[PDB]
Amino acid sequence: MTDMNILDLFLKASLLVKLIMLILIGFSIASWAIIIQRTRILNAAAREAEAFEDKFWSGIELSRLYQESQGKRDNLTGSEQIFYSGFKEFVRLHRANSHAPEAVVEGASRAMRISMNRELENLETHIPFLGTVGSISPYIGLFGTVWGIMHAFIALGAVKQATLQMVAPGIAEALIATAIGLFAAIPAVMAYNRLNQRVNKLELNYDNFMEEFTAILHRQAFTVSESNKG
Amino acid sequence: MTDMNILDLFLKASLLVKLIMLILIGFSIASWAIIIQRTRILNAAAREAEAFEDKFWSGIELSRLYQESQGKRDNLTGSEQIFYSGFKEFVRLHRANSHAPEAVVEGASRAMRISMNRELENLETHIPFLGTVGSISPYIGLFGTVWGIMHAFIALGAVKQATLQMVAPGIAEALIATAIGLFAAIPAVMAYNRLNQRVNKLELNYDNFMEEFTAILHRQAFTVSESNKG
Amino acid sequence: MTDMNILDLFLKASLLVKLIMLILIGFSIASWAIIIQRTRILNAAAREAEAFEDKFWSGIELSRLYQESQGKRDNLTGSEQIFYSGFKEFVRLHRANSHAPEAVVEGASRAMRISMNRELENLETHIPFLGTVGSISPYIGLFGTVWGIMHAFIALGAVKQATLQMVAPGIAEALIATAIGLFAAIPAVMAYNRLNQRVNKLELNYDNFMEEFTAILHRQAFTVSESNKG
């Protein structure tokens, strides 16, 4: 007896079919890689944002915290980078154009939103790749399954009487592309949606930090500017 | 006469096939229990939120309703939880930060928003499970059904005089997994939609009440602070 | 052994089926062409817009900036084109209605909106064709597939004796047709979503620029009006 190994089809699969399997499996590997890397990155980003919020709302004065951040300004992410950029721009705008505290607030706020946009861009990198691959891979498998379909039909076309003997190789050969496509698709969409959700969480958190910090900067600017005119 | 009933062929499912069927059954049980528990939870939460809102908008004193919420603080959810936490943070920051009624009330309102996020997360719990399970269990059943049928037609391929009965049994044994998976998915999607709609209803409950309470607390802090300087 | 060629299937295809397959081929090709051209144009526009936004927010003088742009005006796009036109309108309204900085600013902003909508159109070109093609093609393919099937059963009913052999060609052809339709469709749809996303990104950036330039123009107009009087 011979073991009913699944590769019995893969080896007998037509060259087109093996090509389709190879391309789809490559996209499967890439799906896994980007999924895992984005997973780690988002977990770490959430943890760092937690860490920075915990100390920021611990009551520590923002000047000392700003100097601490400057110590590694080369190395800022998320809430901390928003903090440092807002601090720096607010100080410079307040010192340069104190006559318009509203202008100070507006420029600093746009700088903070700029940093947040950049960080969101960092988090989202290649995520759309996962979404697109998950949506598309079953159709790449479709191409190969279809070519196998047609190979099977021309296979039966060889015999005068049709029957259930001839093309079964061609049939199970055709379907390999579809199976590999679904193999590529399941995790890709799975993680695309999951990391979409987590990133929505992170984006909301960063926006709230932006809001409170922007209000803090506005109050500081307005109070300082009003007091300067006493 | 052999009893080739649905249960019979299911039990006589091949190892991969029987395993897939069992996985689908587990998904079904999990989704059912989650749906019932979360549905009754949503009913309870909606009941509590509506009752508490009816109590709040009757003119009851803020301090009185406030300590009354303190009394069951350990068993507060949704709107009642949000109000209790909001007035607690507002009062605490005001005593510590009476000099900035705006800053006090904004900090308290953001704490209220944070509690709202936490409770909404509690609500969504087990719900993404339902949604993605409904999405994917079709895939789990159909994949295996597909492979089994492929192998069945490979087998009947050797027959000179083809007859469906050499494959109808295998085809059915395969399709059982697809049928069970989809039967279990239907309620998954239905409950997902219904309970998510309820979830958004409650979330709007909470955002609207948060905004109302934040404005009322701004008024309260302004009045108390201005009177304090008389 | 004869290579299993789709050509034998093609020349047996009916008038309508072949024509529809041609429709699908052409639509797919133009999909690819539009995808590429529009993608390149959009990417380059986005990069140039980023560079110009950073250059403007570089603190560079408005009038200096406008002279510099006016030098090469024949090749303005996006942010810089809108800046040029809006600066022109600001200049002329300030010259005519310096006594009304707010009214002058409003006419400035309207010139800006004019230019922006012009650019949005210039860039969006052909995209709705993408959405249309993606959304329409599957139905086309199904239509052709159904047609082939109908002619197949025409071949079948007009024969007293039944058999699988007489029908396989029609089935093969029609299924190929559905497949072709899907092949054309998927790229179109994916591209439509992606491109509209990036376009919205650009649009948001441009609107942000318009409002920011508008407010800076408010400050500029008020300051130029007042300092020349005192």
Binding site: T145, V146, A152, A168, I171 | - | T163, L164, Q165, L175
Partner: peptide, 17 residues
């Protein structure tokens, strides 16, 4: 779906004669 009847067509093709 597209994939699901790739089979069904192949299967009932394979088994009809």
């Amino acid at each position: 779906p597209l994939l699901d009847v790739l089979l069904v067509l192949l299967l009932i093709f394979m088994a009809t004669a």
